[PDB]
Design a protein around this ligand. Structure first.
Ligand SMILES: Nc1nc2c(ncn2[C@@H]2O[C@H](COP(=O)(O)OP(=O)(O)OP(=O)(O)O)[C@@H](O)[C@H]2O)c(=O)[nH]1
Ligand SMILES: Nc1nc2c(ncn2[C@@H]2O[C@H](COP(=O)(O)OP(=O)(O)O)[C@@H](O)[C@H]2O)c(=O)[nH]1
Ligand SMILES: [Mg+2]
Ligand SMILES: [Mg+2]
Lengths: 69, 5, 440, 422
C-alpha cells in the first residue's frame, strides 16, 4: 500500500508536469509557425512591389531610346 | 436539501 | 488564503470589470478611494473579502485584478474614472493599436508584444497571495483581444501556474450589439484554444441579457452600461461564496465539483432572479418560493437555450439575502412536483444549495430594484450545446466560401487552424450529445 | 489613431479641399487653425486628421500634390488655404496632358521621390499611424497615373498599414476627354492589387443626381463636389467621433471586405435634397441616392455599413434597419450572416438635423466597371490614341493585362453573387 501511495502521487506530478510541457511546446510551435507565415506574406508583398519598380524602369528606359532617333 | 452545530 | 485574481481582457472584459468591482465595493462598504471603515485589521486581514481585495498600510483596499487591452481608450476611462484611486497604475495595462476584431492579431501580431508584461504583472499579484486559489478571466468571444489574446494568456497561464483553477466569464456574441461580421470565427477559435486550459466557463449570451433588459426592466434600447449592470449582479452571485462566508455558505469549488462531469463539459447555464424594476418591486415582495421558480423559466436564462429539450446533469442554487433553509427545502419540493426536469440516468437528482445572508445591493442610478433576497441557478444541461450549434452554423456559412479568411491568413494563421478549431467544436457538440444518452 | 491624407491632381485637390472645409467646420476648426466649438466631442478624436502645432493650432495632416500648379494656388488662395502646412504643397511644372503614362512612369516619377519625403515627415510624427486615404480622379493623368504610383511607393514602405482611396470614376456626361476610358482601366488595374478599400465616386451618378434629382439646370463642378463632401464627411464620421462601430480604417476593412480584391464600395447619402428615420433608411437603400451609377437591386449586398447622424431614436433606427433587411432579404447573401452594421452619431452634419450615410460592397458595382470596359474595348479594339502612351515608353501588353485583369474582377463579383448556401 505504501509503494502504491507513492506511485499515485508521482503519477499526478508526472501528468501535471507533462501538461505544462505539452502546452509550452504546442504554444512555441504555433507561435513560430505564425512568425514565419506572416514574414513570408510580407516578403511576397514587397516582392511584387519591387518588380513593379523594375518594370517602371524598363518603361523609362524604353522611352529613352524612342526619344533619341 | 439544506441541513448547521 | 484562497485568493482569487481577476483578469479583464478587452473592452467587454474591462467594462464588465468596472461594473463588477464597483458593485463589489458597494457590497463590502469600500469607498472609491479604497478605504474601508469596517475593517479594523489595518494593513492586513484574513477576512472573506480579502480573497478579492488586498490591503495596504494606508488602510487602502486594493482589487486583486488586472485590466489588459491592446488599445488605451477603454482602460483610459478607468484611469480617469470614479474609481481611479481604487487601483495601482501597474494594474492597468494598455497597448496602442487594438486587434481590429482579428483573433490572429490578438493571439499573435499585437498580442506577443505585451504578453510578457501582462504575465509579469499577474506574477506580482500572485506573490501577494498566501494561497492562491486560481484566476477569473473576463472576456468577449467576438473581439480580437477578447478572443485572441485571452487564448494566448490562458495558454501561458497553464504553463506558469500548472493546474491552478482558471474560470471564464465569456461574452457570447449577439447581433443586436455585434461589432464585427467575423465574430463567429473568433468565437470558435478562442473556444477551441482555451478548452483544455479552462476548468469552468460561464457563457453570457448578450441576446439573452438584451432580451431580459428589454422585457423585465422595460429598457427601450439597452446599452453596454445596461447589460453590464445586470451581468455584474450575476457574477456577484457566483463569487459571493468566495467573498462572504456563513454557516449556510457553499464554496464555489463545491458547486464546481457537481457541475463538471468531464473536463470538457465545463460550461454551466446561469439563470438569475429576480430581475425586476423599482416600479414593479414597490409594494410587491418576492418570496424564496417565487424567485426559485423563476430559475426554471427560460426567459431568465443567461444563455438562449432550452433545458426542456435537453437533460440535466446538475443543479445548484446560489441564494443570497433573506433566505432560510426551511423555505428553500419547501421551494424545491414544489418544483420537484410542479416541473418534470429530466436528469440523465447516471447522475443523482439532488440540488446543491448555498446561502449567503448578505443581501443583494444595487448600484446608484441602477435599473434593478433593491430586493431582500435573490438567487442564481447554475445548471449543467445538454441544452447549452445549442449555443455552440448556432455559432457553428454561422461559422460554417462563411468558411464554406472562405469569406474573410484572408484577414487571418495575412496575420500568419492557416486554414488548418480553422478546420481544426471547427472539428473540436464538432466533437464538443458530439460530446454534449453523448452524455445525454441513456446507459445500458 | 492617426490618418495621413493625400490629395492629388485637379479633381483630387478639389474634393480634398472641400473635404477639409467641411470636417474642419464639424470639429470647429477655423481657416487659421484655431478651435471655437461648443462640444468636447469635437476634440475627442481630432488627432486622427489634425496635428497640434505650437500655439494650439490644428493643422490638417494632408499632402497636396499635382503636376500643374493651376489647381493648388486656387486652394492656397481658397477660404482655408492657410490652414494647410505650406511645406506639404508639392507641385511639379511639366504637367500631364491627361496621359496616365506621364503620371505613372515618366512625368510623375521625377516628382514621386519628393512627395514621399513629405509623407515620411508626417508619418514619423504619428503616435500610431493606422494608414492613408487618397483623393483623386481616374480619368485624368496626375491623380490617376501618379496617384496609383504613389500608392505603390507608399505600400512597399508601409506594407502593414491600411491603404484607402476615394476614387472618382470618369463619365462622358461630365468630360469630353476621349482617353478617360484608358486612364481608368489602367488605374483600376492598380487599385485592385494595392488598395485595401476604395470608395467609388461615379460622375455619371453625381451628374444625374444633380440634374434629375436636384433639378440643377446646368450643374457646376462645385455642385457635384457638394455631394462628394457630404459623402466623405459621412463615411468618415465613425473615424472622427467617439464611437463603437468601424472606429478605424482596419476594423472597417475587416467588416467590409470579405475577399481582398472585391473592396470597391458603393457609397450613398440621404437626404439628397441639398424627414423621418424610416424615410432616411429607405432612401439610403434606393438606387437614386447611390453615388455610383448602379441599381443595387441588380445584384446582392456582400456587406453594408450604415451611419445615421443627428438626434434620433436608436430604437427606431434598429427597428428600421431590421425592416429593410427583412423585406429585402433576397438582396443580401446568405453565406455572410449579420453583414449589415449600423452606427449612430449624435452630432448632425452642418445644415441638416439628421442624415444617413450608406456604404455598401455590392456585386451590383460590376455595372460600373462594365461601363468603363465597354468604353475601353471600343477604343482599344482599334488601337486608338495608343501613341500617347507608347510614346512614354509603355507597352501594348500592359493594356491587355489591365483589360483582362479588370474583367476578372467582374467575374469574381458575379461568382459570389451567384453563390448559394448548401
Ligand atoms: N456585455 C457587454 N458586451 C460587450 C461590451 N463591450 C463589447 N462587448 C461585446 O464584445 C464584442 C466585441 O469584442 P470587444 O470586447 O469589444 O473587442 P476587444 O476585446 O476590445 O478586441 P479588439 O477591439 O478587436 O482588439 C461584441 O460582440 C460586443 O457585443 C460590454 O461592455 N458589455
Ligand atoms: N467631381 C469632380 N470631378 C472632376 C473634377 N475635376 C475633374 N474631374 C474629373 O476628372 C477627370 C479629369 O481628370 P483631372 O482631375 O482633370 O486630371 P488631373 O489634371 O490629372 O488631375 C474627368 O473625368 C472629370 O470628370 C471636380 O472638381 N469634381
Ligand atoms: Mg477594442
Ligand atoms: Mg482586513
Amino acid at each position: 500500500k505504501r509503494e502504491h501511495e507513492r506511485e499515485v502521487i508521482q503519477k499526478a506530478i508526472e501528468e501535471n508536469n507533462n501538461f505544462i510541457k505539452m502546452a509550452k511546446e504546442k504554444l512555441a510551435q504555433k507561435m513560430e509557425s505564425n512568425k514565419e507565415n506572416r514574414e513570408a506574406h510580407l516578403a511576397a508583398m514587397l516582392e511584387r512591389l519591387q518588380e513593379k519598380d523594375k518594370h517602371a524602369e524598363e518603361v523609362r528606359k524604353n522611352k529613352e531610346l524612342k526619344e533619341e532617333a | 436539501x439544506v441541513x448547521x452545530x | 488564503m484562497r485568493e482569487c485574481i481577476s483578469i479583464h481582457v478587452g473592452q467587454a472584459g474591462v467594462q464588465i470589470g468596472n461594473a463588477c468591482w464597483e458593485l463589489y465595493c458597494l457590497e463590502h462598504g469600500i469607498q472609491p478611494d479604497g478605504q474601508m471603515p469596517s475593517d479594523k485589521t489595518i494593513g492586513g486581514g484574513d477576512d472573506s473579502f480579502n480573497t478579492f481585495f488586498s490591503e495596504t498600510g494606508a488602510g487602502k483596499h486594493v482589487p486583486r485584478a488586472v485590466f489588459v487591452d491592446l488599445e488605451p481608450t477603454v482602460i483610459d476611462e478607468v484611469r480617469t474614472g470614479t474609481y481611479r484611486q481604487l487601483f495601482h497604475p501597474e494594474q492597468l495595462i494598455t497597448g496602442k493599436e487594438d486587434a481590429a476584431n482579428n483573433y490572429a492579431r490578438g493571439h499573435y501580431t499585437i498580442g506577443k508584444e505585451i504578453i510578457d508584461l501582462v504575465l509579469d504583472r499577474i506574477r506580482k499579484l500572485a506573490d501577494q497571495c498566501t494561497g492562491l486559489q486560481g484566476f477569473l478571466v473576463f472576456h468577449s468571444f467576438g473581439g480580437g483581444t477578447g478572443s485572441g489574446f485571452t487564448s494566448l494568456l490562458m495558454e501561458r497561464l497553464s504553463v506558469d501556474y500548472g493546474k491552478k483553477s482558471k474560470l471564464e466569464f465569456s461574452i457570447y456574441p449577439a447581433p443586436q450589439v455585434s461589432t464585427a461580421v467575423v465574430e463567429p470565427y473568433n468565437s470558435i477559435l478562442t473556444t477551441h484554444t482555451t478548452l483544455e486550459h479552462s476548468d469552468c466557463a460561464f457563457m453570457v449570451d448578450n441576446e439573452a441579457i438584451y432580451d431580459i433588459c428589454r422585457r423585465n426592466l422595460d429598457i427601450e434600447r439597452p446599452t453596454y452600461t445596461n447589460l453590464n449592470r445586470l451581468i455584474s449582479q450575476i457574477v456577484s452571485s457566483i463569487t459571493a461564496s468566495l467573498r462572504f462566508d456563513g454557516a449556510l455558505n457553499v464554496d464555489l469549488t463545491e458547486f464546481q465539483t457537481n457541475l463538471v462531469p468531464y473536463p470538457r463539459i465545463h460550461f454551466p447555464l446561469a439563470t438569475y432572479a429576480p430581475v425586476i424594476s423599482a416600479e414593479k418591486a414597490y409594494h410587491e415582495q418576492l418570496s424564496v418560493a417565487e424567485i426559485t421558480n423563476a430559475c426554471f423559466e427560460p426567459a431568465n436564462q443567461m444563455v438562449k437555450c432550452d433545458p426542456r429539450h435537453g437533460k440535466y446533469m446538475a443543479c445548484c442554487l446560489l441564494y443570497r439575502g433573506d433566505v432560510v433553509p426551511k423555505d428553500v427545502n419547501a421551494a424545491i419540493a414544489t418544483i420537484k412536483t410542479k416541473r418534470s426536469i429530466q436528469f440523465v440516468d447516471w447522475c443523482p437528482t439532488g440540488f446543491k444549495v448555498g446561502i449567503n445572508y448578505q443581501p443583494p445591493t444595487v448600484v446608484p442610478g441602477g435599473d434593478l430594484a433593491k430586493v431582500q433576497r435573490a438567487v442564481c441557478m447554475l445548471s449543467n444541461t445538454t441544452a447549452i450545446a445549442e449555443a455552440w450549434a448556432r455559432l457553428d452554423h454561422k461559422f460554417d456559412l462563411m468558411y464554406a466560401k472562405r469569406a474573410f479568411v484572408h484577414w487571418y491568413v495575412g496575420e500568419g494563421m492557416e486554414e488548418g487552424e480553422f478546420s481544426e478549431a471547427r472539428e473540436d467544436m464538432a466533437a464538443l457538440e458530439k460530446d454534449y450529445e453523448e452524455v445525454g444518452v441513456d446507459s445500458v | 489613431r492617426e490618418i495621413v491624407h493625400i490629395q492629388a491632381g485637379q479633381c483630387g485637390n478639389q474634393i480634398g479641399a472641400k473635404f477639409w472645409e467641411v470636417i474642419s467646420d464639424e470639429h470647429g476648426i477655423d481657416p487659421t487653425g484655431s478651435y471655437h466649438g461648443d462640444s468636447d466631442l469635437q476634440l475627442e478624436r481630432i488627432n486622427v486628421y489634425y496635428n497640434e502645432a505650437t500655439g494650439n493650432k490644428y493643422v490638417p495632416r494632408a499632402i497636396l500634390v499635382d503636376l500643374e500648379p493651376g489647381t493648388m494656388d486656387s486652394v492656397r488662395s481658397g477660404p482655408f488655404g492657410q490652414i494647410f502646412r505650406p511645406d506639404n504643397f508639392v507641385f511639379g511644372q511639366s504637367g500631364a496632358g491627361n496621359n496616365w503614362a506621364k503620371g505613372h512612369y515618366t512625368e510623375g516619377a521625377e516628382l514621386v521621390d519628393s512627395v514621399l519625403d513629405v509623407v515620411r515627415k508626417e508619418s514619423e510624427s504619428c503616435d500610431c499611424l493606422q494608414g492613408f486615404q487618397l483623393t483623386h480622379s481616374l480619368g485624368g493623368g496626375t491623380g490617376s497615373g501618379m496617384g496609383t504610383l504613389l500608392i505603390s511607393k507608399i505600400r512597399e514602405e508601409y506594407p502593414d498599414r491600411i491603404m484607402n482611396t476615394f476614387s472618382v470614376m470618369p463619365s462622358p456626361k461630365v468630360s469630353d476627354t476621349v482617353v478617360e476610358p484608358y486612364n481608368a482601366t489602367l488605374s483600376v488595374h492598380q487599385l485592385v492589387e494595392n488598395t485595401d478599400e476604395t470608395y467609388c465616386i461615379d460622375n455619371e451618378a453625381l451628374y444625374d443626381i444633380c440634374f434629375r434629382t436636384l433639378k440643377l439646370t446646368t450643374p457646376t463642378y462645385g455642385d457635384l463636389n457638394h455631394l462628394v463632401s457630404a459623402t466623405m464627411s459621412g463615411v468618415t464620421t465613425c473615424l472622427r467621433f467617439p464611437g463603437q462601430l468601424n472606429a478605424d480604417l482596419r476594423k472597417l476593412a475587416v467588416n467590409m471586405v470579405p475577399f481582398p480584391r472585391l473592396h470597391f464600395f458603393m457609397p450613398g447619402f440621404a437626404p439628397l435634397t441639398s424627414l423621418t428615420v424610416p424615410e432616411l433608411t429607405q432612401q439610403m437603400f434606393d438606387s437614386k441616392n447611390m453615388m455610383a451609377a448602379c441599381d443595387p437591386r441588380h445584384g446582392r449586398y456582400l456587406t453594408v455599413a450604415a451611419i445615421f447622424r443627428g438626434r434620433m431614436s436608436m430604437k427606431e433606427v434598429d427597428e428600421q434597419m431590421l425592416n429593410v433587411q427583412n423585406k429585402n432579404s433576397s438582396y443580401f447573401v446568405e453565406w455572410i450572416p449579420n453583414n449589415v452594421k449600423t452606427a449612430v452619431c449624435d452630432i448632425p452634419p452642418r445644415g441638416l438635423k439628421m442624415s444617413a450615410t450608406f456604404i455598401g460592397n455590392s456585386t451590383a458595382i460590376q455595372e460600373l466597371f462594365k461601363r468603363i470596359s465597354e468604353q475601353f474595348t471600343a477604343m482599344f479594339r482599334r488601337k486608338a490614341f495608343l501613341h500617347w502612351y507608347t510614346g512614354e515608353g509603355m507597352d501594348e501588353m500592359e493594356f491587355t493585362e489591365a483589360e483582362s485583369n479588370m474583367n476578372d474582377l467582374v467575374s469574381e463579383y458575379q461568382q459570389y453573387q451567384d453563390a448559394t448556401a448548401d
